[PDB]
Design a protein around this ligand. Structure first.
Ligand SMILES: [Mg+2]
Ligand SMILES: [Mg+2]
Ligand SMILES: [Mg+2]
Ligand SMILES: [Mg+2]
Ligand SMILES: [Mg+2]
Ligand SMILES: [Mg+2]
Ligand SMILES: [Mg+2]
Ligand SMILES: [Mg+2]
Ligand SMILES: [Mg+2]
Ligand SMILES: [Mg+2]
Ligand SMILES: [Mg+2]
Ligand SMILES: [Mg+2]
Ligand SMILES: [Mg+2]
Ligand SMILES: [Mg+2]
Ligand SMILES: [Zn+2]
Lengths: 304, 211, 287, 166, 148, 152, 108
RNA sequence: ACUGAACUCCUCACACCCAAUUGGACCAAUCUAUCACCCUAUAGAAGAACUAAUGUUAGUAUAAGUAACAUGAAAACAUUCU
């Protein structure tokens, strides 16, 4: 007999358990906000070739943004909701070319996770997270498991790779999926308008692997490359990434620095392990901006 | 169907006009529907002449020893199911009342010696002579399943039974046979069975409630 | 040795269990009526001192064998595996009833008795373990309690977190056996024969015998282990699903010997709790 | 036609010795000519084929198929027979040992197709046979553990001989 | 074929040649019709050569039944309980005299496929090959790439 | 792809899905308890609670009278709407109906349902009660509540 | 397109007997506390609903008598009173359907 | 140098690997003659042998539980509504 958390509770115990575990939801998240007052792992300076952590952000939506050229840029809002560092594996255990942190974001009801997952977040002292992504990392960038990561981990002017599952379009035909031309409408054309034509030739008595056929479109992990961060918003933890991010609204994406070779040395002036707001040295404003973006509140621009 | 009225009321309503036809041959019975005068256990010498008028060689003194050999040989034929041997010792009012419930199960009835000699109690009478004889004997029982597991009575312990077995004789070729067995209302209850029984209550429709 | 104390006590329990069956008057038939909202006015024509309320539940369905836990024989709580005595009226009591009062208490004593079977057989043979009683503490208090007295070697002894996990792994091993609670109503004179080697349990037998206008005391047995109790119990040990010996508390007024109380918390298979609700019933069971 | 399943309830075993464990009851029951197909009945007969009779009546009260309403009429008449005729004391102490479905005598009608052609439509009938054995149901076979796979592999190595020689 | 039919190993009954040779027939049983052309040779076998046969091996006890049968049978029963019932239907006298001497010479084991044409029970005298025959031992038991 | 499409398509068009809910809602105002297929009940259930909001706009509102004139195909239920049902729920701001599951229809094995207007004169449905408060899991959680009330 | 060969019963058994086509065992089934008949979770009891559906069928048969023909839905709230019951203070100005039987244990 | 056939030798036994065609030795079952009598013998006879004709007829498969088929709604099953 399968059970759930709500089955054998009375109507006096249902709103009591709801307010209790949502108090321990906000107790465990508020006891992590000062990671430097704990014992942090040592803070190393940036070196050429070091790679640092990324983020996990909820895609909020898009809004236009203007530069001082007077050119409209579309900009996707990525809010960092309760993102933490969950665990650290060295390169000896990973058997890859780099070491890995594990990062989780957007807290989730504890009543709906497996028992083996609920103990991994009990030894860590956090509520469970929805997506758990794994970032390759060097030995310099290694934060203690359990520290939060904020949106000021990124800075404006920095280029960014964003990975999420695309919008699932179900079983789509071969015209929507692969952009096939189909058949003409009139002049006969009895039962062909949206059908794939020939699949293979006659001599090969089979269909090659990797042949474009009808199937389930979308719902796979895609990554966009080289997305500029136009501004950040330190109060609501918003990243303002240039352009369109894969995935629907309110999906969790995977934000990290760009792997593009043109943007490989551009981590010299970035906060290297992550942004620590316990550091307090030159505390950041409400909004950080790139130099080209017209801030709302600036006067109307003029090209004299 | 359930009754003979409910058949004719359905044969009328279906249109089944079944003709009650006349035949020359009738069902030639050899028993009665039970007992003539129901003896009630706690002068009938007219009925011993009306038995002697057709038989003309019959002694009322000899008959309780004849009544035992009718009773004992009828109950030993239950241990083997010799139905051709029950049909000469047991009338067809008594044969379905001692064989239908015991089909597909084995019985190991055995007679040990009696306590009191049998003696005739009453005699009553296309005419059927009828003799009730009292039996105070000592018997064992062991009734089993299809599967051979014991369901009633232990095999070794002999019990004490008080019996009033009404006998009957058709009066040209029939003999004295068992007809029925009087069970008085003041009799002690029988031996309790080995298993426990559930008895369901009323099977309730959702509109009907339990009062 | 507690090897020879187990073989000695169970033979006298079996001698008394065989003695009660020997007084049975050759399957005398009793007639009990089922009182309840469900399935009303059915009777069970049953044997006298062989039939149990589990045999009454076996006639109706499997649903009354699995879900039902106690038995309200004539408005009095009875075990499901305790033999009936006379013509009466039975209800069957479930954990999910509207008023599971006696069902909660009968489950509360049973995990106390299941705890005491773990305590005697966890210490190695050179250590002396002695059971006192099971205090009738309420369910609201958050843990069932069992007072034990250990040897003088273990006076400054307090178990770690890994010791209580070895207590629970022996308490789930008792659940995996699916052992039935062999109940038997014994007089006070035989009870002092079985519990002669334990002075703390002698005086507890004296409490229940004079509480009772006759000399009858409830005895129970899980498997090869006998214990006194105050009332009814559970049918089996498979009813306990979640189980944890939470904590050990040494009571404060102990001048002659440590009256060392054990704490545990448990829930049935019927009333399972989620991992996060159960973990909060563990930090409250440590008091 | 054959009706051998009806006659299996008339086998009378010899009365048992006390130095022998108690024989469980067997109750063979069937319904013939059910207007339902013999291989749509197999999914309902495979479902209940090891279950106890109270769990079988539970999983058939809530199946949407037509034959589940018919098997539940068969299993209820065979449970009423076991306390009446075949001497089982507990209704709940039964389990389904065999639950199969044969085909029945089927009728033939004419299905008209789109032209002068046609087809021969067969009105399907079926049987449903059950056997209840008195007792608790046996536990389902667990998957053989990694210990039991390792024993069979080592017993297969231990059994091999030098082949095609002395 | 051999994958259809059972098979066995070449054996004897009770080590039939080690101490003494025990004749393995116990009985022969002839059903022979008195009037019938199918047992014409079987009547001449009983008349001529069953008395010469029953003296050549006094361990076989022979029963001539002589009942009205259409097919005359010979039912050879052996010492290990096996029964080989064969027919002598319309056989000449020289063909039953070899059919019966074939029944005397053989043992009661089945005439299924014999796997090996031999049976050694101590096949090895110098010790059967294992991988550590014909392999020299290193000093101190040192396996390769082991320093100490 | 029907992301975000909240309306079931029924009937034989978008017109006939309104005429199907209209006869289902006219029967709900008249009888106050209706059996129907489960997809046709919970599609009606938005219209069954948006209608009582239009009866609480008042009798004399012409925008509310036109909506009750459409959505009630028997014109005797428009007095029952503005003078019985909308006065009955004038305290609460929502949740006028309760939708349950019935065992499936015996004809075609369809997932069935019952809506009813809350607080009617009809016999009560066998509602799914929560677990009682005196059960073992609820008493162990009641002991934890009273302790944590003493943390202040 | 027609089959090029005949599918055998070895191939047919592995298609029509794997657990994708087999009937799944359901675990919803509880016992109704009110009647003891067995119901599912998330579904009302079949027995206890037919209690209501045959008690509502009698009440609606008497509502149809007090109205008389169609289009007689009153603007007055309704109250069902069984035998030996008096209309209370809140039933003043309410339509009363006088039923014949006793007030059941589940009606209140 | 070894491997390597149905060649050749070896132990035993031999009428026992071609199409069409041709020669020969046997024979299942049936009926008849006479025997036989748990199923046969010698002969006489003939509707005298079926892994194959898009063979004929009957049964049952496969494709297949597939293609296809059906009942406007609520209800007091009086009625009303679309
Ligand atoms: Mg086009
Ligand atoms: Mg077209
Ligand atoms: Mg065309
Ligand atoms: Mg067909
Ligand atoms: Mg449709
Ligand atoms: Mg060679
Ligand atoms: Mg040759
Ligand atoms: Mg011939
Ligand atoms: Mg021919
Ligand atoms: Mg043929
Ligand atoms: Mg052919
Ligand atoms: Mg098929
Ligand atoms: Mg297909
Ligand atoms: Mg279709
Ligand atoms: Zn119910």
């Amino acid at each position: 007999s399968g059970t759930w958390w709500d089955e054998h509770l009375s109507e006096e115990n249902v709103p009591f358990i709801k307010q209790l575990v949502s108090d321990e939801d906000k107790a465990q998240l508020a006891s992590k906000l000062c990671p430097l007052k704990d014992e942090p792992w040592p803070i190393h300076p940036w070196e050429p070739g070091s790679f640092r952590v990324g983020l996990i952000a909820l895609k909020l939506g898009m809004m236009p943004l203007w530069t001082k050229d007077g050119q409209k840029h579309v900009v996707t809002l990525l809010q960092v909701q309760d993102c933490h560092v969950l665990k650290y594996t060295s390169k000896e255990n990973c058997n890859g070319k780099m070491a890995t942190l594990s990062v989780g974001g957007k807290t989730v009801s504890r009543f709906r996770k497996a028992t083996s997952i609920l103990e991994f977040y009990r030894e860590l002292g956090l509520p469970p997270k929805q997506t758990v992504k794994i970032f390759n990392i060097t030995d310099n960038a290694a934060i203690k498991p359990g520290t939060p990561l904020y949106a000021a981990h990124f800075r404006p002017g920095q280029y960014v790779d964003v990975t999420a599952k695309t919008i699932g379009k179900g079983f789509q035909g071969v015209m929507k999926r692969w952009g096939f031309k189909g058949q003409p409408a009139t002049h006969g054309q009895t039962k062909t308008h949206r059908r794939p034509g020939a699949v293979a030739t006659g001599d090969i008595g089979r269909v090659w692997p990797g042949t474009k056929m009808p199937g389930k479109m979308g719902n796979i992990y895609r990554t966009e490359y080289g997305l500029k961060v136009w501004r950040i918003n330190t109060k609501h933890n918003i990243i303002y990434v240039n352009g369109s991010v894969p995935g629907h609204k309110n999906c969790l994406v995977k934000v990290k620095d760009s792997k593009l070779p043109a943007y490989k040395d551009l981590g010299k002036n970035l906060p290297f392990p992550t942004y620590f707001p316990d550091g307090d040295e030159e505390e950041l404003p409400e909004d950080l901006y790139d130099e080209n973006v017209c801030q709302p509140g600036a006067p109307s621009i003029t090209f004299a | 169907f359930k009754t003979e009225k409910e058949f004719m009321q359905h044969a009328r309503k279906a249109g089944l006009v079944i003709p009650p036809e006349k035949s020359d041959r009738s069902i030639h019975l050899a028993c009665t529907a039970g007992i003539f005068d129901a003896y009630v256990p706690p002068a009938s010498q007219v009925s011993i002449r009306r038995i002697k008028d057709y038989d003309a060689n019959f002694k009322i003194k000899d008959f309780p020893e004849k009544a035992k050999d009718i009773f004992i040989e009828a109950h030993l034929c239950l241990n083997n199911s010799d139905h051709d041997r029950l049909h000469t010792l047991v009338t067809e009012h008594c044969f379905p009342d001692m064989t239908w419930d015991i089909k597909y199960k084995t019985v190991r009835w055995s007679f040990v010696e009696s306590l009191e000699p049998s003696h005739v109690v009453q005699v009553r009478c296309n005419v059927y002579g009828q003799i009730t004889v009292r039996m105070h004997t000592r018997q064992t029982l062991a009734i089993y399943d299809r599967f051979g597991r014991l369901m009633y009575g232990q095999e070794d312990v002999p019990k004490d039974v008080l019996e009033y077995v009404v006998f009957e004789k058709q009066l040209p070729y029939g003999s004295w046979r068992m007809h029925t067995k009087i069970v008085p209302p003041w009799a002690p209850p029988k031996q309790p069975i080995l298993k426990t029984v559930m008895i369901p209550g009323p099977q309730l429709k959702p509109e009907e409630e339990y009062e | 040795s507690p090897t020879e104390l187990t073989e000695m006590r169970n033979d006298l329990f079996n001698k008394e269990k065989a003695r009660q069956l020997s007084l049975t008057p050759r399957t005398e038939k009793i007639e009990v009526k089922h009182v309840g909202k469900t399935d009303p006015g059915t009777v069970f024509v049953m044997n006298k001192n062989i039939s149990t309320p589990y045999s009454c539940a076996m006639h109706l369905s499997e649903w009354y064998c699995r879900k039902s836990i106690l038995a309200l024989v004539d408005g009095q709580p009875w075990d499901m595996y305790k033999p009936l005595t006379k013509s009466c009226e039975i209800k069957f009591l479930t954990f999910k009833d509207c008023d599971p009062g006696e069902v909660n208490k009968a489950y509360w004593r049973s995990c106390a008795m299941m705890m005491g079977c773990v305590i005697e057989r966890a210490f190695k043979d050179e250590y002396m373990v002695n059971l006192v009683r099971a205090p009738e503490v309420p369910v609201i208090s958050g843990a069932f309690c069992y007072d034990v007295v250990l040897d003088s070697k273990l006076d400054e002894w307090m178990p770690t977190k890994e010791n209580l996990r070895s207590f629970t792994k022996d308490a789930h091993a008792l659940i995996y056996k699916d052992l039935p609670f062999e109940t038997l109503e014994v007089e006070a004179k035989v009870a002092l024969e079985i519990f002669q080697h334990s002075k703390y349990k002698v005086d507890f037998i004296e409490e229940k015998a004079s509480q009772n206008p006759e000399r009858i005391v409830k005895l129970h047995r899980i498997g090869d282990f006998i214990d006194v109790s105050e009332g009814p119990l559970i049918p089996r040990t498979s009813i306990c699903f979640q189980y944890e010996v939470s904590a050990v508390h040494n009571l404060q007024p102990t001048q002659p010997s440590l009256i060392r109380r054990f704490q545990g918390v448990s829930l049935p298979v019927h009333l399972r709790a989620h991992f996060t609700i159960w973990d909060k019933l563990l930090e409250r069971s440590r008091k | 036609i054959s009706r051998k399943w009806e006659k299996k309830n008339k086998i009378v075993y010899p009365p048992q010795l006390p130095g022998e464990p108690r024989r469980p009851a067997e109750i063979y029951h069937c319904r013939r000519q059910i207007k339902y197909s013999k291989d749509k009945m197999w999914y309902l007969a495979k479902l209940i084929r090891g279950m106890s009779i109270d769990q079988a009546l539970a999983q058939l009260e809530f199946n949407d198929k037509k034959g589940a309403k018919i098997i539940k009429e068969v299993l209820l008449e065979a449970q009423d027979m076991a306390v009446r005729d075949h001497n089982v004391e507990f209704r709940s102490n039964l389990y389904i040992a065999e639950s199969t479905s044969g085909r029945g005598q089927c009728l033939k009608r004419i299905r008209y197709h789109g032209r002068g052609r046609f087809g021969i439509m067969e009105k399907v009938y079926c049987h449903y046979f059950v056997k209840l054995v008195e007792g608790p149901p046996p536990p389902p076979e667990p998957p053989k553990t990694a210990v039991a796979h390792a024993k069979e592999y080592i017993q297969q190595l231990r059994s091999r001989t030098i082949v095609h020689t002395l | 074929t051999a994958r259809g039919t059972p098979s066995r190993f070449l054996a004897s009954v009770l080590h039939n040649g080690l101490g003494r040779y025990v004749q393995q027939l116990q009985r022969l049983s002839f059903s022979v019709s008195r009037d019938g052309a199918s047992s014409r040779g079987a009547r001449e076998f009983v008349e001529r050569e069953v008395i010469d046969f029953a003296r050549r091996n006094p361990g076989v006890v022979i029963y001539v039944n002589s009942r009205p049968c259409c097919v005359p049978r010979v039912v050879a029963e052996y010492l290990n309980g096996a029964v080989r019932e064969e027919s002598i239907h319309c056989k000449s006298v020289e063909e039953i005299s070899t059919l019966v001497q074939k029944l005397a010479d053989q043992s009661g084991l089945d005439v299924i496929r014999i796997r090996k044409p031999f049976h050694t029970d101590n096949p090895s005298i110098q010790g059967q090959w294992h991988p550590f025959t014909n392999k020299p031992t290193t000093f101190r038991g040192l396996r390769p790439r082991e320093v100490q | 792809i029907s992301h975000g499409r909240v309306f079931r398509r029924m009937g034989l068009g978008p017109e006939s899905r309104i005429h199907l809910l209209r006869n289902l809602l006219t029967g709900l105002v008249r009888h106050e308890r209706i059996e129907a297929p489960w997809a046709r009940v919970d599609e009606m259930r938005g219209y069954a609670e948006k209608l009582i909001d239009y009866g609480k706009l008042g009798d004399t509102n012409e925008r509310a009278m036109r909506m009750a004139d459409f959505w009630l195909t028997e014109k005797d239920l428009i007095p029952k709407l503005f003078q019985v049902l909308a006065p009955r729920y004038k305290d609460q701001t929502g949740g006028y109906t309760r939708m349950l599951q019935i065992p499936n229809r015996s004809l075609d094995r369809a997932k069935m349902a019952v809506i009813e207007y809350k607080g009617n004169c009809l016999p009560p449905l066998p509602l799914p009660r929560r677990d009682s408060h005196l059960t073992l899991l609820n008493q162990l959680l009641q002991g934890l509540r009273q302790d944590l009330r003493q943390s202040q | 397109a027609a089959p090029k060969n005949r599918r055998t019963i070895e191939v047919n058994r592995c298609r029509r007997r794997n657990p994708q086509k087999l009937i799944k065992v359901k675990n919803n089934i509880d016992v109704c506390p009110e009647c003891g008949h067995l119901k599912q979770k998330h579904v009302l009891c079949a027995y206890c609903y037919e209690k209501v559906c045959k008690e509502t069928a009698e009440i609606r048969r008497q509502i149809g008598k007090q109205e008389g023909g169609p289009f007689k839905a009153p603007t007055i709230e309704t109250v069902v009173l069984y035998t030996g019951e008096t209309p209370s203070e809140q039933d003043q100005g309410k339509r009363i359907i006088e039923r014949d039987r006793k007030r059941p244990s589940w009606f209140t």
